[PDB]
Amino acid sequence: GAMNSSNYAELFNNDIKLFVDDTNVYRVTVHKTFEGNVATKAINGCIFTLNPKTGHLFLKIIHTSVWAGQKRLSQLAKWKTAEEVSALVRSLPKEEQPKQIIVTRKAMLDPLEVHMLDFPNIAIRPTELRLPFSAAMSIDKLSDVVMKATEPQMVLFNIYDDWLDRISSYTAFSRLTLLLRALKTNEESAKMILLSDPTITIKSYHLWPSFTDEQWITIESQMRDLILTEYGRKYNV
Amino acid sequence: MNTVPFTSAPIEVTIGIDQYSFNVKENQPFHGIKDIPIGHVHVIHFQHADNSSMRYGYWFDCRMGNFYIQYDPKDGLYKMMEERDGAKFENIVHNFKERQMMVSYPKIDEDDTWYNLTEFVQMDKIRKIVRKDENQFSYVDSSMTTVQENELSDPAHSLNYTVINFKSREAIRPGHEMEDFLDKSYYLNTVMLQGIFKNSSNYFGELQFAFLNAMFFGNYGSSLQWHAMIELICSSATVPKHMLDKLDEILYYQIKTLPEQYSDILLNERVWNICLYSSFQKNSLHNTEKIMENKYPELL
Ligand SMILES: CCOC(=O)CCNCc1ccccc1
Ligand SMILES: CCOC(=O)CCNCc1ccccc1
């Protein structure tokens, strides 16, 4: 059924699985019109489809042209997400296809379940975890490829860089979710933490800086402090 | 006007005939039901006094044969049988009528309730839902499961209603996933009406039969089928106008006849609130919406 804290190690077993987050598929800026009404302008979005064991991220860029002349865009975006995840599964060799797809928002269940009616052995599951994948667009290289796209495009990344050479998937996912939670709670301060020291750089082929094991411990502590700091600023604690 | 005689009544039982119910005491001199209107299917049903477990009964049409009831002390129930000897049958009925041992189908002349509940129900279609080809009448009980219930366990004792499943390959056309799920018109009009049922009369007949089995036997799978067949129409943006108007009449009489005290178990809140207030047909069921709001405002 649903994925929660009780069954958390299941994410790192040898059954292929993907998380799907649709929170950045349909993105808009709201503005006033000349007549003083309100209108939206869409900007490019993306589907965040992640294998939590390997770090492989299938970033499908959703170009604003897909919304042209369409109605009820927030509803359509869920079906377009399911359409594209469906298409991704069909493009993978059988031995690479997931056995489970976990959606981060329960509104994706029926659209995805409908799109995968002819794939009955792939479980479509919700989660009780509050995962910070919306903050993917705070990763500079991901935001850059989305905003520069002029047509639909799929871009492949490893969201863990080379971390799995030194740490387990469980620890890598924990680091990722901590980084993304910090970027979601206070993006300016998180980015300051990650780049404050000009001597630690981001390799051309990486998303995050090239921290040593000890530096990662310092960074992780600073991110926890940020999250707690913001939690106190928010609730006046 | 036709007659279903009873050999005897050896166990105390509540007997119902369509929407009417009466009690018979253990070994009471009771020999059946007369003045049954010709032209409709009927149902004769039973609930034993000492074990209300298992309501059961028989759908029949007196135009198809001479039928009677006899208690079987081995299987412990009142069974319907056919008498092939017409002169024996007529002589039995005449004797029981002369001795005034038969209750009379108490049909008020003004009252169209049974016609309105069975307008599209035909014995031939009942016999394909309930498969027992050697009899002209059909047995149903509280516990019988449907073909769909069994997919999710004796197949010979099953209710073969048409399977409706909104998240299936039958429901959804390749490349029309959003369209077909949010607007079920394809599934209603092409798959079900044109393809399976052939016409709306057969669809309404199965819907009406499902409701009556839900109401008279507490048959849960029949209640599921009735609501699924309602939801499939209400969730379609394109439905022939004559079908919507007829559905409103069908459901009005069903809601009118439903015992008020069974509403909690026989009516699905989600389906009814969706059908009346959110669906494409939310404004097409005026009579049904009015009776539902006046009779069952809590459910809504
Ligand atoms: C390459 C995509 O070709 C398809 O047909 C997509 C199938 N989508 C789920 C489905 C399959 C079959 C019926 C209904 C829904
Ligand atoms: C004053 C209360 O009256 C009742 O409860 C009526 C019960 N059924 C009437 C009936 C009798 C015989 C055959 C069919 C129906």
- A127 and A104 in a single domain? The answer is yes
Give the contacts of A56 (CB within 8 A, at least 6 positions apart). A50, A156, A157, A158, A159
Nearest to A162 by CA among A217, A221, A210: A210
- A98 and A148 in a single domain? The answer is yes
In a domain, A134, yes or no: yes
Where does residue B86 rank: exposed (0-12), middle (13-18), buried (19+ CB within 10 A)?
exposed
Residues B105/B36, Cβ–Cβ less than 8 Å: yes
Where does residue A179 rank: exposed (0-12), middle (13-18), buried (19+ CB within 10 A)?
buried
* Residue B8 φ then ψ, to 5°: -170, 180
Nearest to B143 by CA among B52, B228, B208: B52
The pocket around ligand 2, CB under 6 angstroms, is made up of B 20-22, 103, 106
Question: Which atom of ligand 2 is found nearest the CA of B17?
Answer: 14
Furthest-apart CA atoms within chain B: distance in Å? 70
In a domain, A67, yes or no: yes
B146 in helix, strand or coil? strand
Q: How far is the centre of ligand 2, averaged over its atoms, from the C-alpha of B117 (Å)? A: 20
CA angle, B204 then B209 then B215, to 5°: 125
Domain total in chain A = 2
Residues A215 and A209: their CA atoms lie apart, in Å, by 10
- Cβ atoms within 10 Å, residue B125: 17
* Residue B257 φ then ψ, to 5°: -85, -25
- A28 and A115 in a single domain? The answer is yes
Q: What is the DSSP letter of B6?
A: B
- A60 and A137 in a single domain? The answer is yes
Nearest to B48 by CA among B122, B156, B141: B141
In a domain, A1, yes or no: no
Q: How far is the centre of ligand 1, averaged over its atoms, from the C-alpha of B189 (Å)? A: 21
- A191 and A154 in a single domain? The answer is no
- Cβ atoms within 10 Å, residue A61: 20
In a domain, A190, yes or no: yes
Residues A49/A20, Cβ–Cβ less than 8 Å: yes
> Residue with structure tokens 């029926």?
A110
Residues B181 and B236: their CA atoms lie apart, in Å, by 10
CA angle, A222 then A175 then A92, to 5°: 155
Q: What is the DSSP letter of B111?
A: -
Query: What b/e readout covers B243-263, taking b as 16+ CB neighbours within 10 angstroms?
Result: beebbbebbbbbbebbeeeee
Residues B294 and B300: their CA atoms lie apart, in Å, by 10
- Where a domain ends, among A131, A163, A195? A163
Residues B276 and B254: their CA atoms lie apart, in Å, by 15
Residues A185 and A174: their CA atoms lie apart, in Å, by 16
Instruction: Take atom 10 of ligand 2 and give the residue whose Cα is closest.
Output: B22
B26 in helix, strand or coil? coil
Six-digit token pair at B239?
């439905």
- A137 and A93 in a single domain? The answer is yes
Q: What is the DSSP letter of B18?
A: T
Report the structure determination method: X-ray
The pocket around ligand 1, CB under 6 angstroms, is made up of A 86, 90, 115, 117-118; B 169, 172, 174, 177
In a domain, A57, yes or no: yes
In a domain, A116, yes or no: yes
Six-digit token pair at A191?
């980015």
Six-digit token pair at A4?
């929660």
Per residue, the 3-state secondary structure of chain A, as one string, reads CCECCCCCHHHHCCCCEEEEECCCCCEEEEEECCCCCEEEEEECEEEEEECCCCCEEEEEEECHHHHCCCCCHHHHHHHHHHHHHHHHHHHCCHHHCCCEEEECCHHHHHHHHHHCCCCCCCEEECECCCCCHHHHHHCHHHHHHHHHCCCCEEEEEECCCCHHHCCCHHHHHHHHHHHHHHHHHCHHHHHHHHHCCCCCCCCCCCCCCCCCHHHHHHHHHHHHHHHHHHHHHHHCC
Residues B119 and B125: their CA atoms lie apart, in Å, by 13
Does B169 reach chain A within 8 Å, measured CB to CB? Answer: yes
CA atoms within 13 A on the CB side of B62: 19
Q: How far is the centre of ligand 1, averaged over its atoms, from the C-alpha of B194 (Å)? A: 23
Residues A25 and A47: their CA atoms lie apart, in Å, by 6
Query: What b/e readout covers A87-121, taking b as 16+ CB neighbours within 10 angstroms?
Result: ebbeeeeeeebbebbbbbeeebebbbbbbbbeeee
Residues A146/A125, Cβ–Cβ less than 8 Å: no
CATH number at residue A175: 1.20.80.40
B98 in helix, strand or coil? helix
Which fold is adopted by the domain B116-299?
Answer: 1.25.40
For chain B, list the strands marked E by DSSP. Answer: 2-5, 13-17, 20-24, 32-36, 42-48, 56-60, 66-72, 77-83, 103-104, 138-141
Q: What is the DSSP letter of B11?
A: S
- Where a domain ends, among A111, A129, A163? A163
- A169 and A125 in a single domain? The answer is no
Does A116 reach chain B within 8 Å, measured CB to CB? Answer: no
In a domain, A144, yes or no: yes
The number of residues making up chain A comes to 237
Residues A234 and A228: their CA atoms lie apart, in Å, by 10
Residues A223 and A194: their CA atoms lie apart, in Å, by 9
Six-digit token pair at B28?
């009471």
Residues A163/A175, Cβ–Cβ less than 8 Å: yes
Q: What is the DSSP letter of B91?
A: H
Q: Indicate the resolution in Å.
A: 1.5
Range of the domain at A67: 9-163
Nearest to A25 by CA among A112, A96, A113: A112
Q: What is the DSSP letter of B260?
A: G
- Where a domain ends, among A136, A163, A190? A163
